[PDB]
Write a protein that binds this DNA or RNA. Structure first.
Lengths: 121, 128, 56, 78, 142, 164, 99
RNA sequence: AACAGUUCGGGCCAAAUCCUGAAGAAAGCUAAAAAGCGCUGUUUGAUGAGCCUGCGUAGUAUUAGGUAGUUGGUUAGGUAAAGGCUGACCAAGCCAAUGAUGCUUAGCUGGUCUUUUCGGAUGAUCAGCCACACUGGGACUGAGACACGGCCCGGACUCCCACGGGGGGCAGCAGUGGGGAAUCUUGGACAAUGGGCGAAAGCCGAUCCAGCAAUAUCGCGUGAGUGAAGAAAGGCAAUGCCGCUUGUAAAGCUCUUUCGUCGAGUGCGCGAUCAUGACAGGACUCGAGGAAGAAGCCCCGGCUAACUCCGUGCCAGCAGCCGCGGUAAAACGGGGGGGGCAAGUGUUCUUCGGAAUGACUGGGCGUAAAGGGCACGUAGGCGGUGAAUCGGGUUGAAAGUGAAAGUCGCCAAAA
């Protein structure tokens, strides 16, 4: 508005909410997997997707997807959690990094081996 | 800066781009007379005959037809002599031209006369 | 450019068995009085400069 | 330095008000802000509404480290 | 030619003669013997600073109606700045080539002796200096 | 490498073009370089296509340093680090401009061998030198590269041109 | 006691001292009154030697009474303004060179 | 820096420059009675401290009243120094819509990242300052503390004890256990700079070096050159043109051996200083001397440089966004091939830009979000002329200061 109004008022910024709510700004927070549930993606995409409900070390419990085909995860498997959100399945905003801690990366992948925790075949 | 000043300048500009050639402004002033003259001998107008030196108020300005946007400032601000080299970069054609008009204790200047005499004052107007 | 140039010898400290008091006397009186003299000079000359500035 | 009195009932501790400019270049306006001073004044003599000059001094109270001076423009009171 | 070019011509032919003496009457001049003018462009400068100015910032300055003055020429004001650059160029290259010549016989490696201290600096009026020498005081000189 | 010429759709100065390389360059150069560069008028960012082609030509010219990175080091666009590295990078620029192959032939030379400047060895491989700098080989460099520069200035400027 | 002294001022393994009028109980690099020029302790190539000092104010601070430390006398005599160090007694014997 | 003096008792088992009285203020010592030191006072100067103060210095009104030493005044103390610092008594003020009081976040500054600029994010390393020292509470000495390895008190917590009591404080350096996503060696040396006492010889994990970390930087290297038998294999193909290509690539072969590896040899310079080397199995120069010791990741549906074969069939799965998968998937997976970067790459987190997407520079509010139902009026902003005066703002000039490091220009050394 007028400068006088601007001098006596804040001209405050625009507010948006960052979706990620890991307890801290830390890149990954480790956690233990409570239950492993396969869920169906929102339409049009149609399939079964493997996700694990994980309680982070901060004690907040967040659903985390496992990327790649094949999971050795069982109840209480400790898996480092990164922040990655899949669009098709709503409510899952976290990813599990393969090849670290407990979840074991897929050895077979030969392209993109760095992700999926694969040593060189 | 006043608002009768802004008024005189905008009436000039609007009469110009409307296409008339001779206009009259009722509420007159010394800082406005000085400014009409400054525009004149810098080229932008043709005659600026003020009528009543005191107590009444009337100017008749007859105009050429040059560009003349010339907004007349309202909110005062200082101008030193060595700050114009950067401040007159915030006119319309930042580089080439327009004369930021400055007021001094030694008479109302433009920015050329100012940076020559090394005097300061306060900004009043623009030129484009 | 209006600066001098000359030479100094302050050697021959150890001469006789176990009597360093030679160079010790050197140190004490020589060096102290040296520096003190220099300092006096400085005081007077700099206050000279000051009074020049006042006359200015 | 200059200022105007606002309150008086203090028994040698007359309090005046003085303003200045909190000019913030950023938004480029001359704005006004005040800071209400207090000044010792013997011979207690002032009326709310009449300006005064001041001058600094060593501490004189928990506040009130000013000193009054001449009464500029003493104003009438109905 | 360019002045410093000429200078290096002097130096190079000179020490080449000095090593002619050394290596005896065998003198190479093999590739130099080429004086057919197809395999070469070798564009050499006689003037300097003719490709483009130091800048061409579009900026102006208006003179009033009764200017009662005479304008200047642009090709003419050019080459004045070229002459400034040219003089500075000669000075700087002279100094650098000079020190390189005086450097043809010096020490830049891991060995020195380092007992002089080069008394210097006033930091308000420093146009005078001096040195020290080795364990002798010296001074006032240089 | 010739593969890079094939990519650049032209001739990046591979040496000793064997016979099928002759064939493939004639094919590629004429057919492809024509058809693309001749009459297309694509929206295919011809400006940016050109940009890729030039920023890919230049690095081989100066060996293998990334020149987009040179651009980026300063906040300018170009022409300044150009005039600069060409004022000297001291092996790739001058040694080739006079007598060598700018490639790791003229490189690694400053790494192990010597070319003393003002009789001073400067073995950094990226020096900038201007305004009064004497460039000199060593003698055990001379006793071979005098003959090498002769066989260059003649076998590669007289002989090859004349058989051409 | 203003101790006109020399504080380190440079990269590791190749330092560069600097002359500043300090206070005694101030840190080595601490709050200085003012630097007084410099003293590069490295041997050079133009004149393969060392350089550095300033004048015209060390007079004033000596006059007002600074007691400095002898690693500064090693310069404030080598450039005058002082007497030599009263510990210039002797010299190691047997320096040998062959280059 | 200068000026004046350092006399006597006495007490401390023994005596002191220890204490304590007198005068004047103290105190005398000598390197076999020796000068030269000291100590006290007068007078200055410097450094520094203490105190006080103008101005600038978070958000929050879904926190509107707060405060009785409160606000002033006198009087005594007070303090080294003014003062509600204070007791007493006196008078009732003071702060608040310029947001007081509350409530939440936090050490501040030079500055680091980004941005042309403004701004915004940060205050870690390095320095200015304040605060803080297991938790609370005090105070003593002393120029100089309420003092981190000074004292006393309480608490809380540990550790030994003979059992009574003692003892304990890493938020100094390195080092353990804890929590984490994770942040170093229980190194060396005063060798130098810097501080301390010593007239002088002499003592320090500050510091200077060293140590592990692709933690970032900048580099420099993993070769030069041939090299068609287009090798074999590798793919793809109607399976044209060496079918295409890997591929001059390899292989071979001749140079080259820096960085690094091995062995020699020191006032070179870091103490070049009288001398003082930890660094230092460093460099320095010389030599054995083989390409031999050194190439990886990401991407190839479009955005966006780059593509093909097979597997795969709404399953598996990728997606930063738009979306691909229902037997021809260039998007999933495998084989080959190629682009981008390169000792580094890729993902996530983190902050700015793009983002004019809080618009001062740099917006809008008729139909798109947004003109209050309307006015009144408080501050508040802003708002006629000509004449005069003053000189607060304004503006011209000088000095002081605006720590140094930083940004930046130049210059030079440095790689």
């Amino acid at each position: 508005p007028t400068f006088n109004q601007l001098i006596r008022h804040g001209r405050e910024e625009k507010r948006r909410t960052d979706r990620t709510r890991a307890l801290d700004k830390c890149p990954q927070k480790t956690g233990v997997c409570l239950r492993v549930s396969t869920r169906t993606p929102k339409k049009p995409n149609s399939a079964l997707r493997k996700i694990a409900k994980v309680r982070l070390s901060n004690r907040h419990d967040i659903f985390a997807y496992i990327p790649g085909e094949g999971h050795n995860l069982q109840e209480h498997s400790t898996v480092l959690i990164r922040g990655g959100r899949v669009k098709d399945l709503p409510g899952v905003k976290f990813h599990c990094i393969r090849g670290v801690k407990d979840l074991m990366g897929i050895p077979g992948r030969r392209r993109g081996r760095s992700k999926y925790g694969a040593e060189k075949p | 800066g006043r608002r009768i000043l802004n008024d005189a300048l905008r009436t000039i500009v609007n009469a110009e781009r409307r296409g008339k050639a001779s206009v009259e402004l009722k509420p007159i002033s010394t800082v406005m007379s000085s400014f009409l003259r400054i525009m004149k001998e810098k080229g932008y107008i043709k005659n600026f005959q003020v009528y009543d030196p005191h107590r009444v108020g009337r100017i008749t300005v007859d105009l050429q037809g040059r560009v003349n946007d010339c907004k007349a400032l309202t909110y005062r601000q200082d101008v030193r002599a060595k700050e114009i080299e950067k401040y007159t970069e915030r006119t319309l054609p930042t580089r080439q031209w327009g004369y930021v008009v400055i007021t001094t204790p030694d008479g109302i200047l433009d920015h050329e006369e100012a940076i020559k005499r090394n005097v300061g004052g306060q900004v009043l107007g623009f030129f484009y | 450019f209006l600066e001098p140039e000359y030479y100094i010898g302050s050697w021959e400290a150890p001469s006789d068995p176990k009597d360093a008091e030679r160079k010790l006397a050197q140190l004490r009186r020589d060096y102290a009085k040296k520096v003190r003299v220099y300092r006096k000079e400085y005081i007077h000359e700099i206050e000279m400069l000051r009074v020049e500035k006042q006359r200015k | 330095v200059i200022g105007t009195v606002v309150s008086n009932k203090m028994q040698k501790s007359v309090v005046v008000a003085v303003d200045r400019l909190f000019h913030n270049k950023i938004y480029n306006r001359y704005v006004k802000r005040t800071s209400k001073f207090m000044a010792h004044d013997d011979k207690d003599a002032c009326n709310i509404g009449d300006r005064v000059k001041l001058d600094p001094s060593r501490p004189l109270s928990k506040n009130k480290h000013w000193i009054v001076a001449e009464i500029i423009k003493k104003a009438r009171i109905y | 030619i360019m002045r410093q070019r000429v200078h290096a011509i002097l130096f190079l032919k000179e020490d080449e003669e000095e090593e002619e003496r050394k290596l005896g009457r065998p003198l190479d001049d093999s590739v130099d013997r080429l004086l057919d003018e197809y395999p070469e462009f070798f564009i050499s400068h006689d003037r300097e600073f003719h490709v483009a100015s130091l800048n061409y910032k579009p900026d102006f300055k208006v003179m009033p109606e009764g200017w009662d003055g005479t304008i200047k020429d642009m090709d003419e004001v050019h080459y004045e700045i070229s002459k400034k650059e040219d003089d500075m160029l000669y000075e700087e290259f002279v100094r650098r080539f000079e020190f390189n010549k005086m450097k043809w016989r010096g020490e830049v490696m891991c060995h020195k002796y380092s007992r002089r201290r080069s008394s210097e600096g006033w930091k308000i009026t420093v146009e005078k200096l001096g040195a020290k020498g080795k364990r002798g005081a010296g001074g006032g000189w240089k | 490498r010739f593969q890079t010429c094939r990519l650049l759709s032209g001739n990046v100065w591979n040496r000793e073009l064997t016979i099928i390389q002759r064939r493939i360059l004639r094919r590629l150069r004429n057919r492809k370089r024509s058809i693309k560069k001749r009459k297309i008028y694509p929206k295919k960012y011809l400006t940016s296509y050109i940009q890729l082609q030039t920023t890919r030509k230049l690095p081989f010219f100066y060996g293998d340093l990334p020149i987009t990175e040179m651009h980026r080091g300063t906040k300018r666009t170009s022409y300044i680090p150009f005039l600069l590295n060409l004022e000297t990078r001291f092996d790739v620029i001058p040694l080739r401009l006079y007598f060598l192959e700018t490639i790791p032939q003229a490189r690694q030379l400053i790494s192990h061998r010597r070319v003393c400047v003002n009789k001073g060895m400067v073995s950094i491989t990226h020096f900038k030198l201007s305004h009064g700098d004497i460039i000199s080989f060593q003698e055990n460099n001379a006793i071979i590269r005098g003959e090498e520069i002769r066989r260059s200035f003649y076998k590669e400027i007289l002989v090859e041109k004349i058989i051409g | 006691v203003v101790r006109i002294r020399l504080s380190r001022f440079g990269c590791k393994n190749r330092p560069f001292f600097r002359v500043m009028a300090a206070d005694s109980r101030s840190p080595r690099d601490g709050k200085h009154l003012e630097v007084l020029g410099y003293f590069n302790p490295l041997p050079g190539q133009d004149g393969g030697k060392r350089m550095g000092l300033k004048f015209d104010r060390i007079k004033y601070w000596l006059s007002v009474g600074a007691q400095p430390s002898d690693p500064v006398q090693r310069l404030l005599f080598r450039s005058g303004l002082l007497p030599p160090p009263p510990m210039v007694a002797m010299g190691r014997k047997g320096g040998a060179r062959d280059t």
